[model samples]
Target: QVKKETITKKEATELVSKVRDLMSQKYTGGSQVGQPIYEIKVGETLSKLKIITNIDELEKLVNALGENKELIVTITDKGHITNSANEVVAEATEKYENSADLSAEANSITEKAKTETNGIYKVADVKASYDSAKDKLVITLRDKTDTVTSKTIEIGIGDEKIDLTANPVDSTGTNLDPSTEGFRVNKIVKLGVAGAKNIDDVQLAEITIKNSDLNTVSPQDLYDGYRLTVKGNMVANGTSKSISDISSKDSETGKYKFTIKYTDASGKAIELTVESTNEKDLKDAKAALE
Candidate 1:
């Protein structure tokens, strides 16, 4: 008895896949917008090879191959995206140059500095004050500092040094300026409030004298002596109610400096503005309050 021969589905599928792989290798496309389609040629085969075109011809050719061992075939593909030129610069950069436009932009560095430091000083309240005794310009900034946690750190002698004279560094010799003048050893003591949540309470306000030790005191009591600079100015994202006893005058009136607000350990929010009239100002104020 003679047996009939047939190819499995996988083998038949692979036969078409081989043709596609050959076409892919030879495929070509265009570069410019109006370029013509390109041609791809596959290599030769034995016997009187017939060319395969399109999916229908490929399937039919595969079937015919299974039945006839002597039949041979080759294939060609029309060029497409695979053969196209990389026009990315023209497509993206040139297109953006024409199509994209700026909605808002800065023309001056003054405007840039003002915008960057907006919250620090009210635009409506900018001015300069000169201290005659010190011959220095004074201006207020209203930005919040990073929160201070309860901690104390000491700076020991020789930890830091500053040379005041010009060309302060010397190669072979030393000067008295470096050895004689230096900031005294001191501790940065942040008085942490007792009962205050370690999460968000703080110290170190606009002025060092405004720093408080409120661990065992109420917000109102801990800050009894200090007057406020902005009364009813309204806390950010807070209710219509204002902070405790807002200052009677505008913050620009120059009565106070160094300000901070914090929620105490016992859930009381305190806002304090201080006046450091001179070195003795805060000391005198707190003494009288006590």
Candidate 2:
């Protein structure tokens, strides 16, 4: 006789999130001009978008540019965006999920951009519904911010520090380095999520996140990635002191920063830096740790 493998609660959460991400994203295909495949989201698929209420205010910003502007907007699905490169430079950085915590990160997706070329593009008006039954999070952007400027824009659920992954420390007490010069860094799963069916098995741990908490987990909760359960199995993950306290804006630089510390498989303690700036490019230099 053999025992069966049971589904854990954490495993279920991940299974559901993946499906949601796929359904929430779409790519547009048109071969007329520069416009090609642009992603869109739920709140943006409306009948018509009008900016009549605040069209004059936007004209001033366009006129200030000193050149005739042609406003254009591009939309993307959140699922498509993982780690995106910054403007004026080519470096992949983590994407954002919490729209409320922009100032705490040092270099963030902070640019509230709109297609200002046409002197139009406003989302001052929208009628959206929340499907609390299925458990989803949705946010809408307004005029002059960044939502109104596109025929399509990319939508993504960027990586947060909390959802990290690592193998346990080895007998010598060294965890495997995932980001080494030769270390394969791209295809590692950091977090383990389960669904409602497995809630009974996973609920044995402390209840920081209730079963219903589902998709609302953030980096602040110390969500180390999934690992094997055997003792001394060796792994790398999260801790209280690892992630920076990005609760407030940086008073001096006026940017948001997320400080993180982690140990690699080789037993090297690594420091990670994530800054949240509103599209303001930091100088071309070395990576700084705040």
Candidate 3:
């Protein structure tokens, strides 16, 4: 014998609505199918809830969760435990993790980028300074050598800064030439009035003076270049006269011959030209004459 309940249209309609409400209607994407999930229950059927059906589909669920985490599955099957659309429910969870070596490698890459500007070449230190009252910006730059330069700029209304100081000037290297680095040897300075005592005396000191530019744009005297004067005393014809420059090669040629009286005391002609090697000879000639 079988037992059945007969009901009016209204009572049957209410029962149907209750069954539909027990089932989940929304789509939770990336859900595992046919696998039993302890989190959800199906009262209509006694079977274990199967959210995911096959291992193949389980692998797909694993991919959705990603490799960096442990996966957790949940199922809320309503209406029935059958693995059918609208009948079974499915869901997944990912428990995240971390690695020490991974963190170390990332930090190394960041440091290397800063160390060599992409780890490709040497890096330079940039410096800047600002003068608000003057509206000026100055940048000082240095290289591997003793040389350095300051780039001056007018400040933007935005107020840019100028870098004024830098690594100390590489003042270590030797200055092969210090004097007459720019000015040329003119006739030697002699007497109160410009006179050439001996061409040879003039030649010796030039080699000495030839041993040594403003880095500025402002107009000013080049104290080092223009004020350069050489003095020597030479003897000829039993007489000593001062050796002085009657002319300067200031920004001119190396013809720094000492100005003689145009002629020696005996009216002997003075040579106008001399060689760099004749420096000692010029001095000795005067000392011998002296």
Top candidate by TM-score: 1
Q: What tens digits encode model 3's per-residue C-alpha lDDT throughout 30-87?
A: 2434433222221112343234433444334333432112233233332222222444
lDDT of each: 0.29, 0.27, 0.27
> Which ranges in model 3 have alpha carbons more than 4 Å from their true place?
1-235, 238-242, 245-257, 262-274
The TM-score-based order of candidates, best leading, equals: 1, 2, 3
Error of 1 at 130 (Å): 76
Per-residue lDDT of 213 in model 2: 12
TM per candidate = 0.18, 0.15, 0.13
Candidate 2 runs further than 4 Å off: 1-241, 278-290
Model 1 clashing-pair count: 9
Candidate 2 positional error at 12, Å = 48
TM-score of 3: 0.13
After superposition, candidate 1 runs with Cα above 4 Å error? 1-10, 21-47, 66-68, 75-290
